Design a protein around this ligand. Structure first.
Ligand code: K1Z
Ligand code: K1Z
Ligand code: K1Z
Ligand code: K1Z
Lengths: 259, 259, 259, 259
């Protein structure tokens, strides 16, 4: 099978990468970073997010694996000590796969993006006012610092810091959280996080300024003359190679409660 | 068809009830409060919750309808002015039905209950400490005022006041929120609301005191010698007669944003 | 000087108490639990709160000291290893004193209480609705689980779990936090914690039910036919014997950040 | 007396300004925008904030007055209908004055600023990590979107949207709130708002990046090679001309509860 390995670039991750390549050399496995069917990320969740976006046009043909050489990650959830066992079981194939939902972001001026964690919209220069439209009905006029739309696996990241709920990634949904909303006699927002099912479309529309900072995972670019930002659960999914059982709620416990 | 009408009991709801019965008398419709196939609640969401529990053993054979004679409700979402149109379309049948998920609560000392809004566990006398177990793995030791497990349609009720997310009721899930959790060098909880899919089981287990106040919707009873409280999405669903399109997110907007 | 020592009652605290009494026996110090001028609490913050209330009628004549035989406390902030040094410096006198503000609670049916942490008002049986009146002007009609009025040193306790601010105890103020307030088309509360200076009077007044559960620190009693609950910063203060410098913000850091 | 009037610049505020100048022309009152002793702001709270900063070097010699030609403001709290009565009572003098505390911000690379609402520190490009030091002791390493330090009268503004407490402006304090803090196995922050008395110094210190966006009220500038940001309650105060009794808590009620 064709495989590739990305590295955070520090000494630990690079040497683990070279060792796994050597281990793969003892099997019917070909290193190919153009059309791999297995993508191994060695580093942290940030390294994994970059590997996902490096290959987001071949998502249906790739099984992803994350190894954490630092603290436990939610995508980088296997320890370096297990790398030799990962080489053997990856080479045999026949492992199971698990799929997590993704967020589709459409920016009309169109450009479309996939997020594994979230997409956010923030004020560029000055106040941030957007009309929030849900399935073509005007829901609220938001004024504040910004808005965050999270995938299920993204709920443990930015979403969590904004008061959002943690959602098991088997649920096909997206979650919208507020950043420092104003509420007074003029403006009124819902306050609570909002959780949307598949096929629901949330549209952000400018009121005055048409320039915002729009993020998709780690990528953050200033977008000019934007007329609309549309969010919906993607029809595409990210696929993980299933090594063993590491339940989502145990990863939550190990990351935030104790380990 | 067999039908029954429950009333909040004030002048407005009682006379609307008598008028609808008279209107139903002009059709092939029989008043039966033992085995109705249509249950109409006239009052508020509290009146509707009582109608649901009056007939929770025949849920699969009943279509519920709520009329609000006060402010707009989330279950009582039709106005008294539409009552004559409701009589005509209910008598013809062939209306569509919509189903919302329910929460199954099991109390072991077993007793099982269904909630349309939520079930909560609170301290009876003294401090509240419970071990939270998710799918048989210990997740956290909670110390504080209590815990709330909400259905999707319950998310706009107690859940909302506790910081929970609002979830569209097409999502088959339950949501767990904390009430005033202690977090210091001794105890540690997740803080965030937790959203669980079907077939996930959340178990609350006593640490010292075995007496708690357990609520299911409006019913709140003191339960002695409790050994466990188990939550999971019910296999049963409540069925609403679908009169017209009143989207969930519009009901959210009308109730909390403006109307 | 007259002194007394209270104990949590476990083996550790009792034997530390007996050892300190023996150490005090080597000085001009008399054990008196009727009119002590020095009150030493050995246990935790709960033990200290009970010592404060045991002697709250002689607050102006007592310097309090707390020793924690378990985890660090905010009132019980000296370690057992320092007990022999505490005996020597307490016997000499001439130590400095520090004073923390207290909360005066008046319950009219009058009865008055002093709180070192907080006083709370909760629903007894059924819904909790109270009118909140600030300096005789109606501020809000609160509906929800209850309200909490905290001293500065209480802000790290119940107040913290309810989202309240942590206030340095040199500030003469009280802080009001909400417990699970309802906000919809009917009811409207401020949401935010409220911080009041001296001489401001916050009055809670019943709307329907006149029975509530009222707490003052660890004491919680059901109060019948209550017509009003009045909160204001007390003119009385608790006095601590100042052993050395242990800044409030360092106690916050050691308790909640790391130690 | 020397007076000046600033205007939001819309038709309503400009014509009200010209009418008040005409009214002042009937008294011993001289228009001077260089050394006024009375500064009248006509517009909203934003207009008032700009008037404060236009004259922040003569604060001890100026009494400020705010008139709101739109919705009620917290500084612009008098209605246009009262303008003719304001002219008469301002011309006589002998009115009372009320003083609100201010926040002193020191930026070391030094530059010092006064805030009437708040000062905030946010990430410029990339992640935001700062060490928080309280009275020279390291309190926490904050990672997240930013931090906000509010005056008492600022607590109803940005501070409120970030979960901060509302503080009566007679309290000489400042309040620190977090913006989307990360909390996991790596980082740990207090979470709660922090309220500091006079003479307490809160210092923000860079960890990696030394470039941040620093705001003081409406002014927001990018500051390069910053080594420290120091916050403390200013020794200076803003003085308002006291027209009549409009209590702070009533302004809170009228702005956020109902009016
Ligand atoms: N104010 C804010 N509060 C919270 N989060 C904020 C935030 N601003 C931005 N963000 C998040 O940063 C992401 C971009 O940085 C790469 C990443 C990531 C990531 N993914 C997850 C996830 N799914 N669950 C849990 N932790 C996750 N991290 C970890 O977040 C940290 C980096 O932020 C590191 O500890 C990562 O772990 P590691 O790389 O060290 O292993 C964005 O996508 C956004 O979510
Ligand atoms: N501290 C607390 N904060 C918030 N909620 C609290 C709460 N303690 C208890 N509860 C909720 O009470 C329920 C029991 O009272 C009957 C009901 C109901 C109900 N259902 C919903 C729903 N799905 N969405 C939105 N509003 C709903 N209400 C409305 O809540 C109010 C009554 O509480 C009335 O306005 C009801 O509207 P009406 O009857 O006047 O039409 C419990 O089940 C629990 O949820
Ligand atoms: N849902 C709730 N969330 C949070 N707090 C809640 C709460 N319900 C009630 N409460 C608080 O209990 C108090 C009554 O119990 C005695 C006490 C105390 C106390 N004082 C302080 C303080 N000033 N700062 C910080 N920790 C403090 N504790 C510690 O709280 C714990 C006991 O609750 C123990 O760890 C105590 O430490 P220790 O005894 O083990 O040393 C009430 O007064 C109320 O505040
Ligand atoms: N995410 C955010 N969430 C909340 N607030 C945020 C914020 N980002 C920035 N800010 C605040 O803006 C200020 C700069 O804009 C000028 C101002 C002001 C102001 N002062 C107060 C005050 N003391 N109490 C209550 N409302 C106040 N406003 C009103 O806020 C609105 C403008 O933001 C207008 O309604 C103002 O009213 P008006 O001008 O229409 O009369 C900053 O200083 C900061 O506080």
């Amino acid at each position: 099978m064709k495989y590739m390995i990305t590295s955070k670039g520090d000494e630990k991750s690079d040497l683990l990468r070279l060792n796994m390549i050597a281990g793969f050399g003892e099997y019917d496995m070909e290193y190919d970073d153009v059309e791999p069917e297995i993508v191994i990320s060695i580093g942290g969740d940030g390294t994994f997010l970059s590997a996902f976006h490096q290959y987001e046009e071949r998502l249906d043909e790739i099984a992803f694996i994350g190894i954490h050489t630092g603290h436990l990650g939610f995508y980088a959830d296997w320890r370096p000590a297990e790398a030799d066992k990962l080489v053997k079981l990856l080479a045999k194939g026949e492992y199971q796969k698990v799929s997590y939902p993704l967020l589709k972001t459409t920016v009309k001026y169109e450009a479309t993006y996939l997020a594994l964690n979230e997409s956010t919209v923030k004020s560029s220069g000055g106040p941030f006012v957007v009309d929030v439209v849900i399935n073509d009905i005007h829901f609220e006029r938001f004024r504040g610092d910004g808005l965050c739309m999270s995938t299920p696996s993204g709920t443990t990241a930015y979403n969590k810091s904004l008061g959002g709920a943690l959602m098991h990634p088997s649920i096909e949904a997206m979650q919208l959280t507020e950043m420092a909303s104003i509420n007074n006699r003029v403006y009124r927002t819902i306050g609570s996080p909002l959780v949307f099912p598949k096929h629901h479309v949330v549209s952000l529309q400018p009121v005055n300024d048409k320039d915002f900072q729009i993020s998709v995972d780690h990528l953050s670019i200033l977008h000019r003359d934007v007329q609309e930002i549309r969010y919906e659960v993607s029809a595409k999914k990210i696929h993980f190679a299933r090594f063993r059982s590491f339940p989502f709620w145990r990863r939550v416990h190990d990351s935030f409660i104790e380990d």
